[PDB]
Amino acid sequence: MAANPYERGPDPTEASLEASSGPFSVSETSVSRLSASGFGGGTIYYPTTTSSGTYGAVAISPGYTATQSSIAWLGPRLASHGFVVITIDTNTTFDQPDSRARQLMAALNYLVNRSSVRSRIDSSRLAVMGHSMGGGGTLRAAEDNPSLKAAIPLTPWHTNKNWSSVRVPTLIIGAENDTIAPVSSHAKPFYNSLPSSTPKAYLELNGASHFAPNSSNTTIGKYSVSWLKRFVDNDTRYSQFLCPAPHDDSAISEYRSTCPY
Numbered sequence: 001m002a003a004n005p006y007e008r009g010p011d012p013t014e015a016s017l018e019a020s021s022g023p024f025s026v027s028e029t030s031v032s033r034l035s036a037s038g039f040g041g042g043t044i045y046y047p048t049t050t051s052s053g054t055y056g057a058v059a060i061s062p063g064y065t066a067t068q069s070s071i072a073w074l075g076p077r078l079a080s081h082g083f084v085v086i087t088i089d090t091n092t093t094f095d096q097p098d099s100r101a102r103q104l105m106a107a108l109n110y111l112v113n114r115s116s117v118r119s120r121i122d123s124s125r126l127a128v129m130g131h132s133m134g135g136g137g138t139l140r141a142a143e144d145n146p147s148l149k150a151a152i153p154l155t156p157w158h159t160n161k162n163w164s165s166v167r168v169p170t171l172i173i174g175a176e177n178d179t180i181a182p183v184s185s186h187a188k189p190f191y192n193s194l195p196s197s198t199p200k201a202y203l204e205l206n207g208a209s210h211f212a213p214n215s216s217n218t219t220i221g222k223y224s225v226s227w228l229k230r231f232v233d234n235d236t237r238y239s240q241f242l243c244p245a246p247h248d249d250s251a252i253s254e255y256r257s258t259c260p261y
């Protein structure tokens with residue numbers, strides 16, 4: 001038996017993470033706006049299998065004026081690697097980041113306590129994601145809920161630039177050519193303010209616009225899955241993708257250097 005009880009799926013490869021689907025078949029159900037307490041409803045994507053144990057859960061928020069159609073592709077992509085994922089609609093499409101932060105947590109609370117798939121979820125292993133203003137809400141949710149295992153703001157937008165109290169492992173994904181949430185005034189200031197004692201990363205998509213997260217994106221999928229695996233599942237099999245080194249090679253038992261050079 002693997003020492004880590006939360007490991008799911010076979011040993012990862014670059015190819016499996018770049019593919020459109022992970023190893024788990026995915027089913028879906030929905031929660032209506034009326035049934036959703038504290039948010040505007042959503043779609044739940046979950047692994048059909050339960051025989052390998054429970055999974056961590058992730059809530060994903062869209063951005064200003066947007067609905068869950070703008071983040072829908074993330075549902076099957078992440079769930080197929082062994083996660084229960086809810087893509088939410090917000091109370092109103094004009095909600096600000098700090099409101100979206102509260103709705104992300106309300107969605108996780110619904111998943112854990114009242115959803116039809118609650119029995120597939122390990123309530124102690126939760127994460128938050130979001131696009132644009134929903135990425136700003138992801139940062140605020142992480143700051144206010146340090147028990148979260150991971151946070152992934154996608155091209156985030158927020159007026160607050162100081163996130164030095166965030167103790168949740170955070171992967172910020174920025175778009176190089178973003179003109180709506182320019183990385184020079186949003187994503188990068190956010191990352192620079194995160195504590196160095198918190199596991200963190202900043203990934204910038206080459207030549208990408210603010211809307212890159214709204215359609216299938218191999219890079220977003222690979223590193224988002226790797227981040228969630230590493231920190232929601234404590235799955236160190238995915239460190240090779242977040243912190244590559246020559247000793248990932250099976251022929252190399254050790255590699256040390258004074259890189260970068």
Ligand code: NA
Nearest residue numbers: 033036039040
């Ligand atoms: Na509601």
Ligand code: NA
Nearest residue numbers: 258259260261
């Ligand atoms: Na150096």
